Ligand binder design. Structure first.
Ligand SMILES: CO[C@@H](c1ccc(C(C)C)cc1)c1nc2ccc(C(=O)O)cc2[nH]1
Length: 157
């Protein structure tokens, strides 16, 4: 079953990244951006329900959100795997880019901006406070740039 309690799970899924990012060590510097950004997504959605009783618009919106809830599985899941030491180099060397959750963060912004329009019309929540609007990938590359360099010189674990 998926009662009202689910509302707390969906929002928690995105929060899990915040703590998961702390677990990392090497690429932890890069993931830090993914966890800080993702937090701003379920931030308003979490506090919302906190305001009063079960806060949720029409069911039609549930469908759009269903796509976002899964978006977290991508980041969270990836973090669990990346947690390893060799796995990091595996992708790093098997990817011209430097960021680990590059493609992941990409969809994250889409799943958010996709439901945002529905959230702004459904609920009185001021979406896109300031952090949104511009792709967070641009800045993500900066961190990954230096993060990748340091990785070059990593013998021990
Ligand atoms: C995936 O969508 C979630 C959801 C999560 C967060 C939000 C914030 C407040 C915008 C809104 C909606 C959701 N929609 C629902 C509709 C009905 C019921 C019900 O009790 O029958 C439960 C629901 N859960």
């Amino acid at each position: 079953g998926s009662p009202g309690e689910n509302l707390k799970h969906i929002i928690t899924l995105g929060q899990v990244i915040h703590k998961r990012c702390e677990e990392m060590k090497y690429c932890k510097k890069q993931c830090r951006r993914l966890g800080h950004r993702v937090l701003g997504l379920i931030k308003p959605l979490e506090m919302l329900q906190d305001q009063g009783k079960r806060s949720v618009p029409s069911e039609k919106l549930t469908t759009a959100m269903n796509r976002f809830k899964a978006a977290l599985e991508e980041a969270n899941g990836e973090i669990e795997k990346f947690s390893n030491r060799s796995n990091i180099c595996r992708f790093l060397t098997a990817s011209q880019d430097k960021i680990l959750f590059k493609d992941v963060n990409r969809k994250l912004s889409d799943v958010w901006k996709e439901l945002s329009l529905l959230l702004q019309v459904e609920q009185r929540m001021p979406v896109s406070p300031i952090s949104q609007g511009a792709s967070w990938a641009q800045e993500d590359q900066q961190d990954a740039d230096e993060d990748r360099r340091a990785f070059q010189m990593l013998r021990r674990d």
